[PDB]
């Protein structure tokens, strides 16, 4: 669960609790996660935030049901995302939606992840 009063701090604590380069100490503390792959994660939600604004949840429930699968498939390919869908409770908090204002809050959580990822790195 992520609520409207905690999700940004959850997102900061998830981006910090995330692995880094142990070796290659020339410019250290660089993540084993790249900006392109995390923007690939946010691309899945950017075309649902607009329709969370526009139209009803009973046409977006199908697209959230496939959003679970999109996060599963991105978790399976690279191990960098695989240790981000667990740190950030993404698959846990994706089952927690059930309306519009939690879909919007989840998309804002993804943006908070991207924001703290740009801010650290």
């Amino acid at each position: 669960i992520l609520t409207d009063e905690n999700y940004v701090d959850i997102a900061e604590k998830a981006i910090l609790k995330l692995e880094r380069n142990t070796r290659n100490r020339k410019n250290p503390d660089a993540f084993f996660l790249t900006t392109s792959k995390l923007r690939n994660l946010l691309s899945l939600t950017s075309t649902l935030f607009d329709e969370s604004k526009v139209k009803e949840y009973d046409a977006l429930l199908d697209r959230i049901a496939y959003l679970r699968v999109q996060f599963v498939y991105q978790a399976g390919r690279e191990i960098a995302v695989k240790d981000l869908i667990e740190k950030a409770q993404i698959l846990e908090a994706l089952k927690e939606i059930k309306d519009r204002e939690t879909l919007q809050r989840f998309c804002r959580y993804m943006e908070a992840l991207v924001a703290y990822f740009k801010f650290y790195g």
């Binding site: 923007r39 946010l42 691309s43 939600t45 950017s46 075309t47 935030f49 607009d50 329709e51 604004k53 526009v54 139209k55 998309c107 943006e111 991207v114 924001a115």
Partner: protein
């Protein structure tokens, strides 16, 4: 006397338009040039302010003898149709531009439309270093159509200027079709057609038989 006659039209978009819009609380990835929409149906709008604003400045290349440099320096054919502030007689002038609302939203479900706007990626490419600069700007979709009312006052001050003004109205509507009505415009984004140009009196008694023969002709 007093009369009010009503220019109806149906605005058909082509490469549909982007009348730029509101929200600051948007996203980090999604639509960052939003379009203006109805607050209640979330359908796109053509506001009457942008219609009047393009129509003045496209009629003002044509109907100003001396160059404008300001409104209230227009040439008493546009001051009476669009108002000045600084003529004593031309302040409320004779034309009301209502906001156009999306009409064929049920027609645009028989065609395979997921949403009544579209998001279009647009990408400033840098010409040295070749680095890219993406953006997602929203626009109404192509075959969108709009109700268009435009109301005209005919008092006794419209002594014999009704026909002369309707020349100017149907000149401005055909001049918007050669230009773009808001948005990028030089990149697509504009092209508007006006169908079903039809003028009817809504108040008073005036003849609309001879009015609908410089509209449709």
């Amino acid at each position: 006397t007093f009369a009010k006659i009503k220019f109806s039209a149906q605005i058909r978009l082509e490469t549909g338009l982007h009348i730029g819009g509101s929200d600051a609380f948007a996203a980090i990835g999604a639509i960052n040039s939003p379009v203006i929409k109805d607050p209640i149906t979330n359908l796109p709008i053509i506001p009457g302010s942008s219609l009047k604003g393009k129509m003045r400045t496209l009629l003002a290349k044509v109907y100003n003898e001396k160059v404008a440099e300001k409104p209230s320096d227009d040439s008493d054919i546009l001051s009476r149709l669009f108002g000045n502030s600084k003529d004593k007689r031309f302040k409320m002038g004779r034309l009301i531009f209502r906001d156009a609302f999306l009409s064929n939203a049920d027609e645009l479900d028989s065609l395979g439309v997921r949403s009544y706007t579209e998001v279009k990626f647009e990408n400033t490419i840098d010409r040295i270093t070749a680095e890219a600069n993406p953006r997602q700007i929203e626009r109404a979709i192509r075959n969108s159509t709009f109700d268009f009312e435009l109301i005209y006052e005919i008092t006794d001050e419209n002594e014999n200027q009704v026909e002369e003004d309707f020349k100017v109205i149907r000149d401005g509507l055909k001049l918007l079709e050669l230009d773009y009505l808001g948005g990028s415009g030089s990149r697509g984004y504009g092209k508007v057609a006006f169908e079903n140009l039809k003028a009817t009196t809504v108040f008073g008694n005036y003849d609309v038989k001879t009015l609908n023969e410089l509209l449709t002709a």
